[PDB]
Amino acid sequence: KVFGRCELAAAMKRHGLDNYRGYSLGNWVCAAKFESNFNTQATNRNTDGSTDYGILQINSRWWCNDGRTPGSRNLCNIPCSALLSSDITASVNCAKKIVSDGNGMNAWVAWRNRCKGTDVQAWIRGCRL
């Protein structure tokens, strides 16, 4: 695509993600950055044969269905292709569920290895709320 630095910060915002269970808007921004480089169409197969889907790289073995990962559950009751939409709502919604799963933002490798415990706000500096 891809998405824009502040295009996203603003898009995640009014989807009510800015302080969502503690996590400043900046973390999601920074998460999107490293998981997919703001590419909504991003896809990545893991070793277990599963595939990571979308801007926040959401896995098929749990949250979304792709008819290609046996022994998987589709926890967000949604097909994985809908996560590849330029519309963000699907992705955000399913993300919101992943953060309250009990383990928080740590559910993203990229985040807790490139965002966590760092100045996370610089990611939304200058952007129009």
Swiss-Prot record:
The keyword Protein transport appears for this protein: no
Protein name: Lysozyme C
Gene, per the UniProt record: LYZ
A Pfam entry, by short name: Lys
Comment field (misc): Lysozyme C is capable of both hydrolysis and transglycosylation; it also shows a slight esterase activity. It acts rapidly on both peptide-substituted and unsubstituted peptidoglycan, and slowly on chitin oligosaccharides.
Taxonomy, superkingdom: Eukaryota
Cellular localization per UniProt: Secreted
GO term, biological process aspect, one: cell wall macromolecule catabolic process
